[PDB]
Amino acid sequence: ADAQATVKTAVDDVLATIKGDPDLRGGNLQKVFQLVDQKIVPRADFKRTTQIAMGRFWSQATPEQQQQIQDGFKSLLIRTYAGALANVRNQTVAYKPFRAAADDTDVVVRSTVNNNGEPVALDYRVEKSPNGWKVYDINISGLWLSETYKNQFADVISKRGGVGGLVQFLDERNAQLAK
Ligand SMILES: CCCCCCCCCCCCCCCC(=O)OC[C@H](COP(=O)(O)OCCN)OC(=O)CCCCCCCCCCCCCCC
């Protein structure tokens, strides 16, 4: 499967799984985490997303901090979008032309979700790894998440004096979202 096929298959899997599970649609958060782990993670490279978000500070973090930040960032995103996922009912997705070369290894896949009549643009950055195509970024409301969080994280690291500050910030954000 090429980049666009990988994205299409994964997104269809997510949509079909939600539509078949009333408990997830009812807002069961544990099940949303499980959905992400089973249906998204195997087709994603979230370590790369986290690396991009940390920028020059990635190398400054201990291996343990790197894991904690990836886990906290992942939790932050799942909790942020859990409502949107649970609210899925009839959404379908159309793909725009794939414009990169077949031999390119870092590409963009562009799509439009029909959200109850409202076009919702979702684009994806996809990289071909030794173990297949993996999504490492998503574009929502015109913005690449890795870029938004790169800027947000750099600001936190600046104001709080380092990587430890970012861990603290992610803990705060996850606590706020849990409420
Ligand atoms: C970094 C790698 C990411 C890989 C992700 C690939 C999988 C894509 C799956 C896409 C499913 C789209 C369903 C939404 C459809 C919709 O229609 O949502 C409709 C809503 C609008 O809702 P509303 O009309 O109620 O208005 C709300 C006001 N009442 O739009 C949105 O909130 C914006 C789009 C949200 C898209 C969410 C995608 C999931 C984010 C990733 C979470 C996992 C991160 C952890 C990574 C390991």
Nearest atom (ligand 1) to Cα of 39: 7
Q: Indicate whether 130 and 74 sit together in one domain.
A: no
Handedness of CA 124, 29, 167, 63 (dihedral sign): negative
Provide the number of structural domains found in the chain: 2
Q: Indicate whether 68 and 154 sit together in one domain.
A: yes
This structure was determined by X-ray
Torsion of CA 167, 171, 172, 178, to 10 degrees: 160
Q: Indicate whether 77 and 102 sit together in one domain.
A: no
Token output for 10 = 């994964």
Query: Is the CB–ligand 1 distance for residue 36 below 6 Å?
Result: yes
Cα(174) to centroid(ligand 1), Å? 18
| Interstrand relation of 106-115 and 118-129 (parallel, antiparallel or unpaired) | antiparallel
Q: How far apart are CA 75 and CA 145, in angstroms?
A: 14
